[PDB]
Amino acid sequence: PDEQEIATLEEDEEELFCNRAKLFRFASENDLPEWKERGTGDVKLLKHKEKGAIRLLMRRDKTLKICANHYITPMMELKPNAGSDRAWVWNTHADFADECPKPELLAIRFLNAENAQKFKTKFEECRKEIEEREKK
Amino acid sequence: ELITILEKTVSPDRLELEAAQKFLERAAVENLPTFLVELSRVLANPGNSQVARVAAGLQIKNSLTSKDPDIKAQYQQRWLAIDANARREVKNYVLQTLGTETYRPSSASQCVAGIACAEIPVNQWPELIPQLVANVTNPNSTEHMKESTLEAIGYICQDIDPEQLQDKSNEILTAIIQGMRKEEPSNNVKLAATNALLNSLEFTKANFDKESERHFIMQVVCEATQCPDTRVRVAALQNLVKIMSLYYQYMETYMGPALFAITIEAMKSDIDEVALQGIEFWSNVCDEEMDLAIEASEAAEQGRPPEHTSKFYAKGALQYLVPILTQTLTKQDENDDDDDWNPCKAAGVCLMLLATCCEDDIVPHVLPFIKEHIKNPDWRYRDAAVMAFGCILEGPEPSQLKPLVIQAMPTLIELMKDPSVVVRDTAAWTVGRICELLPEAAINDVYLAPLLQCLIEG
Amino acid sequence: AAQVQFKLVLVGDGGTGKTTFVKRHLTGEFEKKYVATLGVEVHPLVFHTNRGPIKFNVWDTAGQEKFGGLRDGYYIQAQCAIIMFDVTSRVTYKNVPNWHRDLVRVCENIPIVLCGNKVDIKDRKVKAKSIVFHRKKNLQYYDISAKSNYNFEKPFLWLARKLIGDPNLEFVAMPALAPPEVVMDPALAAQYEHDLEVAQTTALPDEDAA
Numbered sequence A: 001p002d003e004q005e006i007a008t009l010e011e012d013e014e015e016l017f018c019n020r021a022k023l024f025r026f027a028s029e030n031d032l033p034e035w036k037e038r039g040t041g042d043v044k045l046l047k048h049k050e051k052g053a054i055r056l057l058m059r060r061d062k063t064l065k066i067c068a069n070h071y072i073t074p075m076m077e078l079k080p081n082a083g084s085d086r087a088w089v090w091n092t093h094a095d096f097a098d099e100c101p102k103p104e105l106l107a108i109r110f111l112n113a114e115n116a117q118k119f120k121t122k123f124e125e126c127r128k129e130i131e132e133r134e135k136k
Numbered sequence B: 001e002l003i004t005i006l007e008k009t010v011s012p013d014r015l016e017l018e019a020a021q022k023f024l025e026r027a028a029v030e031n032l033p034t035f036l037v038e039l040s041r042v043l044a045n046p047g048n049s050q051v052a053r054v055a056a057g058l059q060i061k062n063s064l065t066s067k068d069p070d071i072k073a074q075y076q077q078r079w080l081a082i083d084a085n086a087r088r089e090v091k092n093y094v095l096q097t098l099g100t101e102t103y104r105p106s107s108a109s110q111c112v113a114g115i116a117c118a119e120i121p122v123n124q125w126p127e128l129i130p131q132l133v134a135n136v137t138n139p140n141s142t143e144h145m146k147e148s149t150l151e152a153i154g155y156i157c158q159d160i161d162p163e164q165l166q167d168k169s170n171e172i173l174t175a176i177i178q179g180m181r182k183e184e185p186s187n188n189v190k191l192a193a194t195n196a197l198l199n200s201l202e203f204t205k206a207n208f209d210k211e212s213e214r215h216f217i218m219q220v221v222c223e224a225t226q227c228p229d230t231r232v233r234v235a236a237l238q239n240l241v242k243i244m245s246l247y248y249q250y251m252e253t254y255m256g257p258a259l260f261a262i263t264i265e266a267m268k269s270d271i272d273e274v275a276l277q278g279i280e281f282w283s284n285v286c287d288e289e290m291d292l293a294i295e296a297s298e299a300a301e302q303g304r305p306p307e308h309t310s311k312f313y314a315k316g317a318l319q320y321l322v323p324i325l326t327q328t329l330t331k332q333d334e335n336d337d338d339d340d341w342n343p344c345k346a347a348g349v350c351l352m353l354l355a356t357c358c359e360d361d362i363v364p365h366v367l368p369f370i371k372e373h374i375k376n377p378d379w380r381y382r383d384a385a386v387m388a389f390g391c392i393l394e395g396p397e398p399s400q401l402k403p404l405v406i407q408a409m410p411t412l413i414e415l416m417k418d419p420s421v422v423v424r425d426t427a428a429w430t431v432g433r434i435c436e437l438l439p440e441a442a443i444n445d446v447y448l449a450p451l452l453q454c455l456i457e458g
Numbered sequence C: 001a002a003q004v005q006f007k008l009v010l011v012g013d014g015g016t017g018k019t020t021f022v023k024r025h026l027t028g029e030f031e032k033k034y035v036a037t038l039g040v041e042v043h044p045l046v047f048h049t050n051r052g053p054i055k056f057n058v059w060d061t062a063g064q065e066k067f068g069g070l071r072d073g074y075y076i077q078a079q080c081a082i083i084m085f086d087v088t089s090r091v092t093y094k095n096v097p098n099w100h101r102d103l104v105r106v107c108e109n110i111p112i113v114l115c116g117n118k119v120d121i122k123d124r125k126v127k128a129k130s131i132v133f134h135r136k137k138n139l140q141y142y143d144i145s146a147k148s149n150y151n152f153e154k155p156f157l158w159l160a161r162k163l164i165g166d167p168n169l170e171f172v173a174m175p176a177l178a179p180p181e182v183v184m185d186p187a188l189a190a191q192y193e194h195d196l197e198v199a200q201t202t203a204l205p206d207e208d209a210a
C-alpha cells in the first residue's frame, strides 16, 4: 500500500507541555452561542527548533484526530475563567483543525486545580517568550 | 428519458439527489400506470447500465411494498386498480427480463415478488408459478435465469401469507430441492436455492408435517452441508439451525445418526464462518431446552405439559461438547479485540449456556481441563482455563462449588498479576463473577464485605 | 484517486441512532435535540490507519417510514453498512431482521455491523443475553453510546479491517499541518473580544451540566 512512513510532523519541534484534558468549542455561528464538546486528549504545546514559533495542537482519544490546531499570539492574554478554578478560555483567529482557517473560541478543563495552574503558567511563559521574540 | 435521472440517483451530491427524487415523485404522482410502464421498459432493455436497471427495479418494488402493513396493503389495493392491459404489459416485461441480469443480486426478482404478493391472493397471475417452475426445471435455462427465478421464488415464499400458496407449496419445494441437489454444477445456483429454502422454512410447516417430505428435506439439507463451497455450508448450517428452532419435536429421528457428526465437524473446522454456526447450533439447542424446562416447571402445577418433548440432547452431548469448547477457547491472539466476534466468544457463551442448562453435571467434564491448564506456561491455555472456570460458576449449586477457596482463589489472585494482559483481564472478569457468587457460598457474612472490597481493588 | 473511499450506509431505525453518531465523528459534539433526518444526508468521514488514509462516504438513511423518500434506492453499489438499534426500546431491535433483509436483497455479502446505541443511559431494556441476532447471521456486534464515547470508534475500525483486508490495522495519529498566520481589522478584534467575554460569562453553565 501507500503507507510509506507515517510522520506526525511533530519533529523539528520541542514539546514544552503535554497533559490530559477536555476541550470545548464555542458555537459562535449558531444562534445560541453556548458551548459544545470538541474531544478529550493530550494538549500539546510545540515550539519550533529554530523558527521560534509556539503552537497549540490537541488530538482526540482512541481516534487520534485533530480537534484544535492554531499558533499562539501575544494578543491571547487577558480573558480567564477566574470565576471557576477548573477552566480556561482563549480566542484564536486562525484555526486549522479542519484544514481551513476559522475563528474559534475554546475552553479547557484539565482535572481540578493543579494541572490548570501549571498549564496557565506554561502558557504565560510561552506567550512572554513570543512577545520578547516579536519585540525585536 | 428516465435513464438520466435514474443514473443521477447514485451521485453523492445533495442537489442531484434532491432533483432526482423530485422528478421521481412528480412522475409517480402524475400518471402511475405510464410511469410504471416506462420503468419496466427501462428495466427490460439489457442495453442500459446496471445502475439504471437496478434503480428502476427498486422504484417499481417501492411502488408496491412498505414496511408498515397498512401502507403495504394500500399499495397493493392501488396496484389492483390499475388498467388490466397496462398491468399485463408491465408483468410481461418484468417476467421476460429475468435471466438477462449479469449482476448477482437481481433487481427484477424483487419486482416479481411484489407483484406476486399483490396478485396471488386474488389469483390474478396464474401463470407465474408454472412459469417459474418451468424456468427452474428446464435443463436449457441459463445460470442467471435459474438464480433469478430461485431468488424470486424465495422472496415470494418469505413475503406472502403462508395460507395462500399451500396448494403449490409441493411444487415450490420440489423446484427448490432440485436447485439444491448435488447434480447442479453452478455454486451460485446452489447458494440461491439454499437461501430460498432458508427464507421459505416458515412457509413449509404443512410439508414438514408430512413424514416423507420432512425426511426428504432433512436428507437434502444434510447432503448440502457437505458442499465444497464455504458459503453453501454456512447457508446449510443456518438452515439446520432454523429447522432445529422451528421443528424441535421432529428432530428425534435425525439427531445422532446424521446431525451430531455434522455439527461436531463444523465446530472442529478451522473456518470461522463454519465454526460460528457449529457453536450456534448447540447454543440454540440449549436455549430451546431451557425454554422447555421452564415450560415443564410451569406445567408441574398444571399436571400435563402441552408440548414438552425435551429429549435433553444437550445433556447427552455434554461430554462431547465440553472438550471441543475448551479447545476452541485456546485459539486467541494478543492483538485481537476482546469484543471481536471470533469463535472464542461463541464458545464461551455456549459454555455458559451449558452450565446454566446441565447445572450440577457440568463440573466433572470441565474441572480436569482447569486443573491441567491453570498453570500452563502458554498464556493462551491459561486464559482458556480461567475463562472456563469463570463461565462454569453460574448454574451449579454453590455448595457443590465449595472447591474454589481451596485452590482457585490463591491461583487467580496470582493470575491477576500475570504479565499477559489478556489473562489478567479475564481473571478480573472471573473474580468479578466470584464477587457475586460469594454471598451465596459464604457460610456467614463475617468476611463478606472486607473480602469483597479487597477483590474489587485486586 | 489516491483515496480508498467506500460508500457506507447507515440504516438504523426511527430515531435513536444516526445523525448523532455520525455528527460525533464529523465535528465532535452531542446533539441533544431530535431533528428527524429528511433524506439521505451524506457526510464524508476521513480516518487515518497504518495502511494509509481511508475515507467513508457515509450515507445516512432516515429511519421514519414517511421520511424515507427513496427507501431502498440508496442501497445501490454499497460496499459496507451498519445496522443500528436502541437498547432502550425492544421495538427497534425487533426491526433489525427487516433491515438486514433489505440490505441483503440489494447488496451481495457486504460487511454489516450491528450496533446497540444508548448503553450509558442505564435501565437497559434489551439485556445483553437477549441479543442473539448477530449469532444467527454471523454479524459483528458492539455496544456503543455517543453520549459517553463508549466504543464509538469500534464499528469503523472493524469495517476498515474487513474492507482493507488487514486484521492488524489500527488507527494512527492524523498528521498535523502548520496553520497560516493572518491578521484582520481591529474592529473585528474588538467584536471578538466582546464575543470572548460573552463566552467567558457563559462557560460556567456548561460546567454545572458537566
Ligand SMILES: Nc1nc2c(ncn2[C@@H]2O[C@H](COP(=O)(O)OP(=O)(O)O)[C@@H](O)[C@H]2O)c(=O)[nH]1
Residues within 6 Å of the ligand: C012, C013, C014, C015, C016, C017, C018, C019, C020, C021, C031, C032, C033, C034, C035, C036, C037, C062, C063, C064, C117, C118, C119, C120, C121, C145, C146, C147, C148
Ligand atoms: N446516540 C445517543 N443518543 C442519545 C443518547 N441519549 C439520548 N439520545 C438522544 O436520542 C436522539 C436520537 O435521534 P437521532 O438518532 O438523531 O434520529 P435519527 O437520525 O432519525 O435516527 C438524539 O437526538 C439524542 O439527543 C445516547 O446515549 N446516545
Ligand SMILES: [Mg+2]
Residues within 6 Å of the ligand: C015, C018, C019, C036, C037, C061, C062, C063, C064
Ligand atoms: Mg435519522
